[PDB]
Amino acid sequence: SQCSSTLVKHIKAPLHLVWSIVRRFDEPQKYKPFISRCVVQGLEVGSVREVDLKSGLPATKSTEVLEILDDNEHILGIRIVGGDHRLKNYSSTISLHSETIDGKTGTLAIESFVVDVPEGNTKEETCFFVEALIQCNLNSLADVTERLQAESM
Ligand SMILES: O=C(Cc1cc(C2CC2)c(-n2cc(CNC(=O)c3ccc4cc(F)ccc4n3)nn2)c(C2CC2)c1)NC1(C(=O)O)CCCCC1
């Protein structure tokens, strides 16, 4: 079985600023709070990033492949292909879109994933685990880019 879900986040910063952060396949640690470091050899499709998680977690690293980087429509797609975690066949897509909330331009982020349900867990538990982490990441992306936006004011 799999869990497939989509999360949406409203960000009070312009798309060009949010995308400048999200597009850095080589620098996820700039807003993903559970990631420490990241190294990419050679940002083209097929690029492989080796990700160091923060110390004190059950896993320590992830290996992920760049499946999509569309700089015109603002789509980033990745797939996890290794590491000392339990997540199997994880892939995700995030896209950014301009929107106007309260008369001010902002950015809508849409992030979708598909992942296997491990044999020892329920599908509900798998969805909850992944959705909570992505929500954490999207909340942090909003915090980071809204802060950059304020610092530019
Ligand atoms: O943000 C991150 C960073 C990131 C990446 C990883 C592992 C290396 C993939 C981890 N992790 C995972 C683990 C060990 N548990 C699992 O494997 C795991 C797998 C299936 C599970 C199913 C369940 F029912 C309950 C618990 C489960 N537990 N130890 N550390 C973390 C820790 C939990 C906070 C954070 N990753 C994502 C991103 O968008 O980059 C967003 C979340 C989804 C992956 C992509």
From Swiss-Prot:
Binding annotation for abscisate: 32, 59-64, 86-92, 111
Residue pairs linked by disulfide bridges in the UniProt entry: 3-127
Location of the motif Gate loop: 55-59
Positions bearing the site annotation: Involved in interactions with PP2Cs: 58, 122
Major subcellular location class: cytoplasm
Keyword Methyltransferase: no
Entry keyword annotation includes Disulfide bond: yes
A single BP term in Gene Ontology: abscisic acid-activated signaling pathway
Top-rank lineage group of the source organism: Eukaryota
Alphabetic keyword roster: Abscisic acid signaling pathway, Cell membrane, Cytoplasm, Disulfide bond, Membrane, Nucleus, Protein phosphatase inhibitor, Receptor
Motif (Latch loop): 85-87
Site feature location: Involved in ABA binding: 33, 78, 130, 133
Sequence segments annotated as region (START-like): 1-146
One annotated Gene Ontology cellular component of this protein: plasma membrane
Location relative to the cell: Cytoplasm; Nucleus; Cell membrane
GO MF entries: abscisic acid binding; protein homodimerization activity; protein phosphatase inhibitor activity; signaling receptor activity
Complexes and interactors: Monomer. Forms heterodimer with PYL13, thus antagonizing PP2Cs-binding and ABA-independent inhibition of PP2Cs. Homodimer. Binds ABA on one subunit only. Binds to CARs protein in an ABA-independent manner, both at the plasma membrane and in the nucleus. Interacts with ABI1 and HAB1, and possibly with other PP2Cs, in an ABA-independent manner.
Family listed: Belongs to the PYR/PYL/RCAR abscisic acid intracellular receptor family.
Function: Receptor for abscisic acid (ABA) required for ABA-mediated responses such as stomatal closure and germination inhibition. Inhibits the activity of group-A protein phosphatases type 2C (PP2Cs) in an ABA-independent manner but more efficiently when activated by ABA. Can be activated by both (-)-ABA and (+)-ABA.
Domain remarks in the Swiss-Prot or TrEMBL record: Upon interaction with ABA, the 'latch' and 'gate' loops change in conformation leading to a tight dimerization and the creation a surface that enables the receptor to dock into and inhibit the PP2C active site.
Protein name from the UniProt record: Abscisic acid receptor PYL10
Protein source organism: Arabidopsis thaliana
From-to range in the entire protein, with total length: 25 to 179 of 183
